[PDB]
Design a protein around this nucleic acid. Structure first.
Ligand SMILES: [Cl-]
Ligand SMILES: [Cl-]
Ligand SMILES: [Cl-]
Ligand SMILES: [Cl-]
Ligand SMILES: [Mn+2]
Ligand SMILES: [Mn+2]
Ligand SMILES: [Mn+2]
Ligand SMILES: [Mn+2]
Ligand SMILES: [Mn+2]
Ligand SMILES: [Mn+2]
Ligand SMILES: [Mn+2]
Ligand SMILES: [Mn+2]
Ligand SMILES: [Mn+2]
Ligand SMILES: [Mn+2]
Ligand SMILES: [Mn+2]
Ligand SMILES: [Mn+2]
Ligand SMILES: [Mn+2]
Ligand SMILES: [Mn+2]
Ligand SMILES: [Mn+2]
Ligand SMILES: [Mn+2]
Ligand SMILES: [Mn+2]
Lengths: 97, 95, 106, 87, 106, 95, 82, 97
DNA sequence: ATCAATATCCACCTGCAGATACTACCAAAAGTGTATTTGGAAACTGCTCCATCAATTTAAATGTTCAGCTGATTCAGCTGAACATTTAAATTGATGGAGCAGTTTCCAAATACACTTTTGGTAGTATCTGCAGGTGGATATTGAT
DNA sequence: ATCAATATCCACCTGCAGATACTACCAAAAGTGTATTTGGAAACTGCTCCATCAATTTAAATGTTCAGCTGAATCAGCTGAACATTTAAATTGATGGAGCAGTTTCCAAATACACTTTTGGTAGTATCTGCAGGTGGATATTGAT
């Protein structure tokens, strides 16, 4: 059988998703998360379905650009693997923590 | 010659209540004056947006109150709201 | 002939706050209680900072609050630090803080 | 309504491959095992902050439905302006 | 019976812009040239993005501009990228960009 | 029966000037409408503060012009200033 | 003995700022890097401050011009008016 | 002939400068830089004294805070010495680049 | 361990830069009296948003194998820290004049208000078309050997 | 460099979700036209506070010597990638019901506006005083041996 070497399929994935624009998290799970969190603030809320889509577009863009910053933090440490400490440096320099 | 208005005297009044034997330098007072103006502007601007978002012509204490909750961190908001309400109740219940 | 500040039980000028809200183009109309409410919050936050700043003066053996004491007050407080996270206090300096990896090997 | 459902642990509905796809779009080649829980915690913080402000606009308007505009204004408040949803 | 836009040589609505400047409570008074100037700026900016976005569509063999083309327009242009530096374009994706060290071999 | 205004029809005219054979999706147009509203509020916001700073009660094309220079980066500022000045000059003399 | 104005921001002064920022050890290349960063920072803020001055038809940059410029740059400064 | 180890005087300066609030660039050289930069935007400008001071408080606050982030970047790469690449990383994550 | 070089600490002292306090206007509050303007209340009926279930489609989880990345370890060369000595620049305190800011003037321009006209929005169907998502199959790129 | 496995590119074709097209349309604005009110540009000016320059205190530059940090090198242990197969969730397109926004009309309560009196707040000016910085002496930290 044929096998791609570790890193080859990952690079293929980067090209593919950097080329496309669809949301990468399934819709129903993200919607339950939004509902749960918001229920904890205020019971008996409804959501316009576009309110949830707006939250998902914002959330994914937030996370994509945080991973870019995290990636730069890993590479700064002479690694290719992102670690929680890369995310934490990124958020600290951003003034999020 | 022109009058230059400032929160200085009121900041000083409040300082006397809180630390009767503590003074304050010129520069610190100027810092406190920027603080009051900045916070005024932030709260007023948010209250303004809220009114416009809701197609209302008036900034009422309710817009202020929601503005305080959007802008101030948790516990700060809680005590600010209660001071705000306290002062409004006191003021209305005045003959 | 009694001030709205005294009526509301405040040190901060409810009258001035009213004017500043009118001439600030915040909305066409301003309600009676908005300036009382806003004055109260402003007074409250002033008291909050002055308290802690006063305390920092005390610990440093001083009776006059300078900018340094304001900075210490604000940045040693999680909530004031956050509200003023993008503000610079002139002549404030910074908090003493050295990263532990930089300390000599005890 | 004959009842009302109880929501628990919905953050785990954000799977490891979904998080991996987001990292790929972000340009990440290799991912440590602990990233997935770290990211779940960051996303939860982000949503709490934005949902909190959106719900505040909703309540202020005396509504029981969170509108797209409530979310848009909340995102703008946080310097995360979003285009394509009414402002 | 002339529109102020046609008088100004603009496609963008001068009357509308004047009214939005009134309703937004930006100042007590709004001068007659204010909404003409601002309408012109808004028109110029949308011409600038639409030109680049139409080109991006063409580079991708499409007759219809989609958000992806809007986002390629913005992020490939230094100045528009800065103007919209804190703006998220829904369904825009990102620019292809893989760091050097991540590529194989040496 | 509800009414809601947008800049859609004007965005489309401009599009027809620059790319006669190119359409635009409804989601793209929505982004363009947010874009215009966003830049309107930013310029008008800057123009507001600018007037306030100078004790002016009037927003004139001179405030709009300074707000454009504060807000826009270099080359876009230069060209938006021309187009604005040009449209104001023409507006005065056409009438 | 010419030397540009930027070089008037000396190595020792940059060293001091780094110390307040908690820095123990400083590479030789930092000093030029830092001068470049300060120049960009000053350009961005001064341009905006001058823009307020010109708008007010003044020949003097006021503290308020600078304060306003800092604010709109997201660097609110307290202690200088406003 | 007593001599302190490399790092002992550095640590001491940190404690010293973290305790004080005085401006750390001399006034005149900073004033000249400011005037030189303003000249490229409009010629023959004057400056209120407090305007130069405002610019200096701001610039010095900016650089100190950037030096903190830079330090966290150096430390992330397991170093104790700040390099231009640390400044560059800090600035890129901040969105200054 | 000891021994000494230097940094850091605390107590006390004192004149002066920078506080507080006392005063005499008066701009702007507060009071007082009509003059608009507003935004629930109550009563609409009419969609979106929520729920459920079945059929169909797409993704997640798991098991297994091992490539290659991370982190530990060790070391030597170079570069930045420390510091004495040599050199230069900034700080300080002293004086004309630019220009900011204060005042008084008036007309060009902005508000107001009241008919007159038209362009923008949507609603109802009407018509149509760019392209997503399905097919080719020819053209790469990767990795085993 | 050679073969073959598996991915990728690109080609044409074709249903249709979504976009362009009227047609009525109507109405909510945008425009037009006098009629009233005023903001701020202008010009004149007085006097703060800004720039220039000639006085001392303070720092920067420079050379030298070496501690110890950074970067290179090497490698083993094991994490995380690749991928086949199994297992689970989401998606899609039904349908129905209620619950809530949303358009609409009433005036009672609220805020604007105007004008008249009565301060609290400010600038000026006149005292008071925290504490900066200096000195002395005790003891702590650091680093050599
Ligand atoms: Cl980690
Ligand atoms: Cl109110
Ligand atoms: Cl104008
Ligand atoms: Cl470097
Ligand atoms: Mn819950
Ligand atoms: Mn039950
Ligand atoms: Mn002692
Ligand atoms: Mn004095
Ligand atoms: Mn060696
Ligand atoms: Mn070596
Ligand atoms: Mn060297
Ligand atoms: Mn003159
Ligand atoms: Mn029409
Ligand atoms: Mn296709
Ligand atoms: Mn095929
Ligand atoms: Mn006037
Ligand atoms: Mn190393
Ligand atoms: Mn593993
Ligand atoms: Mn009095
Ligand atoms: Mn002392
Ligand atoms: Mn001594």
């Amino acid at each position: 059988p044929h096998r791609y070497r570790p890193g080859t399929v990952a690079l293929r994935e980067i090209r593919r998703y950097q080329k496309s624009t669809e949301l990468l998290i399934r819709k129903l799970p993200f919607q339950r998360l939004v509902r749960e969190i918001a229920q904890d603030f205020k019971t008996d809320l409804r959501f316009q379905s576009s309110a949830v889509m707006a939250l998902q577009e914002a959330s994914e863009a937030y996370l994509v650009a945080l991973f870019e910053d995290t990636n730069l933090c890993a590479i700064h440490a002479k690694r290719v693997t992102i670690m929680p400490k890369d995310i934490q440096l990124a958020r600290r320099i951003r003034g999020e923590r | 010659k022109t009058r230059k208005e400032s929160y200085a005297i009121y900041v000083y009044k409040v300082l006397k209540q809180v630390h009767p034997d503590t003074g304050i330098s010129s520069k610190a007072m100027s810092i406190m004056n920027s603080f009051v103006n900045d916070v005024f502007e932030r709260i007023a601007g948010e209250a303004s947006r809220l009114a416009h978002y809701n197609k209302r012509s008036t900034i009422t204490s309710r817009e202020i109150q929601t503005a305080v909750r959007l802008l101030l961190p948790g516990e700060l908001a809680k005590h600010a709201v209660s001071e705000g309400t306290k002062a409004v109740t006191k003021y209305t219940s005045a003959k | 002939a009694k001030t709205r500040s005294s009526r509301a039980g405040l040190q901060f000028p409810v009258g001035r706050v009213h004017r500043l809200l009118r001439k600030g183009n915040y909305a066409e109309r301003v309600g009676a209680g908005a300036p009382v409410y806003l004055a109260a919050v402003l007074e409250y936050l002033t008291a909050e900072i002055l308290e802690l700043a006063g305390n920092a003066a005390r610990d440093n053996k001083k009776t006059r609050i300078i900018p340094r004491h304001l900075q210490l007050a604000v940045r040693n407080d999680e909530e004031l630090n956050k509200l003023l996270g993008r503000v610079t206090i002139a002549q404030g300096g910074v908090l003493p803080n050295i990263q532990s990896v930089l300390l000599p090997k005890k | 309504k004959r009842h009302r459902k109880v929501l628990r642990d919905n953050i785990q509905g954000i799977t490891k491959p979904a998080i991996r796809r987001l990292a790929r779009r972000g340009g990440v080649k290799r991912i440590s095992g602990l990233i997935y829980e770290e990211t779940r915690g960051v996303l939860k913080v982000f949503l709490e902050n934005v949902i909190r402000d959106a719900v505040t606009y909703t309540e202020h308007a005396k509504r029981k439905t969170v509108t797209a505009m409530d979310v848009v204004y909340a995102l703008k408040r946080q310097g995360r302006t979003l285009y394509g949803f009414g402002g």
